[PDB]
Structures are given as structure tokens and as C-alpha cells.
């Protein structure tokens, strides 16, 4: 649930519907331009101070890296 709310600020888009004469490759990149202003890290790297940038990279890393992404515990417990 934390990751679902982070997606918009981390350039993560869901699959879009495709009509006729439409290519997801040519559409997903268009959608990515719509939510370009929301992509946090790039924005801060563009207007932020080195200190702000460093703090943004660290926070962004912590936000995207969760146990559910590829780690589990019950196995180690046993």
C-alpha cells in the first residue's frame, strides 16, 4: 500500500488501454510525459541544492525498497 502511493512520484504507471491504431510503446511514453512533473527525484535534481538532492536520493531509495519486493522471513524463522 505504501508502494502504491509512491508510484505516482516514482514514475510507475499501470498498463493503459489500447484502441486501434495505438501502440502502448507510443502511448506509455506519452502518459509518462503527462506525469513528468510528478517525478520527484528528477525535479529536485533540476532545481534543488546538492543537500536536497542527496536527501532525495536516499529517501527515494528507502521508499522503493520494501521486503515485499523480493524478501521473506518465515523461511529463515524455520
Amino acid at each position: 500500500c505504501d508502494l502504491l502511493h509512491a508510484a505516482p512520484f516514482q514514475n510507475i504507471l499501470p498498463r493503459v488501454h489500447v484502441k486501434e491504431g495505438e501502440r502502448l510503446d507510443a502511448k506509455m511514453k506519452r502518459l509518462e510525459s503527462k506525469y513528468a512533473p510528478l517525478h520527484l527525484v528528477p525535479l529536485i535534481e533540476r532545481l534543488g541544492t546538492p543537500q536536497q538532492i542527496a536527501i532525495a536520493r536516499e529517501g527515494d531509495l528507502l521508499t522503493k525498497e520494501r521486503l515485499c519486493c523480493g524478501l521473506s522471513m518465515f523461511e529463515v524463522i524455520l
Binding site: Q51, I55, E58, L62
Partner: peptide, 12 residues
């Protein structure tokens, strides 16, 4: 605030 953010990152 930056010091605070940095400490939060560390504790995490």
C-alpha cells in the same frame, strides 16, 4: 530540517 531528514534516513 535537513539534519532532521538525515537522522531519519539513518534511523531507518
Amino acid at each position: 530540517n535537513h539534519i532532521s531528514q538525515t537522522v531519519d534516513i539513518h534511523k531507518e
